[PDB]
Design a protein around this ligand. Structure first.
Ligand SMILES: [Zn+2]
Ligand SMILES: [Zn+2]
Ligand SMILES: [Zn+2]
Length: 72
């Protein structure tokens, strides 16, 4: 399973993930890729604000889903 995270500059991050991965896990991956602090990261999928403790599956994030790093 793979998901795409678009940075604030529109750069695409490709991540290998599992359905039970938490948002917090995803943030750790983004930090490895881009050097962005987890506490600086705010993610959206389908207009939903994503919380650290919830899983990709909780938010119906599927194979090939695209998340955005946002300011708000
Ligand atoms: Zn596993
Ligand atoms: Zn994982
Ligand atoms: Zn910090």
């Amino acid at each position: 399973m793979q998901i795409f995270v678009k940075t604030l500059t529109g750069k695409t991050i490709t991540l290998v993930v599992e359905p039970s991965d938490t948002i917090e896990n995803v943030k750790a991956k983004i930090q490895d890729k881009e050097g962005i602090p987890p506490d600086q990261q705010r993610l959206i999928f389908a207009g939903k604000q994503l919380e650290d403790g919830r899983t990709l599956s909780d938010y119906n994030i599927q194979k090939e889903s695209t998340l955005h790093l946002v300011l708000r």
